[PDB]
């Protein structure tokens, strides 16, 4: 059975250049994050998933150094996990194509019942993750600015309309927004 060691010892295969300790708990914290998701007989892969990895690793990898090693880490954090990182990267990128729009035309697509790939993923059943709700909160983020400012009733909006769990949203992404400076902190 593979363990978590396995998946770090693959991370450090394919990354072997050295990393800061402040950035190897954070990324160390994610491997074992992923890693116990995938092995939940509840949990599934989607673009929503994609896009809160993603959005996590960019935001606390943000100030890293050396800078020109972030792509390369991230292709280590995924192959170590079984995933790809070009899937995720393009599933991330298929959200950009809601950018600008009001979140009525969101609610519209939703309500329809058959909405478009990778709005479906709102749809969440399943094993629920804070990644799932760090990706809401990027998607939120190419809708119209009004969206996020007022996250909200943005959040409110939505929780007649999607399964995806909003209080635990609420909850999860009131910590993420709160300790967004921790890493550059004692």
Same mark, same amino acid.
């Given at each position: 059975p593979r363990t978590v060691s396995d998946t770090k010892r693959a991370f450090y295969a394919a990354h072997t250049r050295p990393i800061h300790s402040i950035y190897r708990r954070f990324i160390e914290e994610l491997l074992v994050e992923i890693h116990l998701l995938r092995v939940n007989v509840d949990f599934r892969y989607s673009p929503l998933f994609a896009l809160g990895v993603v959005t996590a690793f960019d935001q606390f990898m943000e100030?890293? #150094?050396?800078? *020109?090693d972030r792509d390369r880490i991230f292709h280590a954090l995924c192959v170590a996990e079984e995933m790809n990182p070009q899937q995720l990267k393009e599933d991330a990128a298929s959200? #950009? #194509?809601? #950018? *600008?729009?009001?979140l009525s035309q969101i609610l519209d697509e939703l309500n329809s019942g058959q909405p478009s790939a990778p709005l479906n993923s709102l749809n969440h059943t399943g094993k629920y993750s804070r990644l799932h709700a760090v990706g809401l909160y990027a998607f939120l983020q190419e809708?119209? *600015?009004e969206v996020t400012i007022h996250l909200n009733e943005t959040l409110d909006q939505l929780a007649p309309v999607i399964p995806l769990p909003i209080e635990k949203v609420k909850r999860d992404l009131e910590l993420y927004r709160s300790n967004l400076d921790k890493i550059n902190q004692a």
């Open positions: 100030g890293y #150094q050396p800078e *020109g959200w #950009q #194509q809601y #950018q *600008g729009r009001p809708l119209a *600015g």
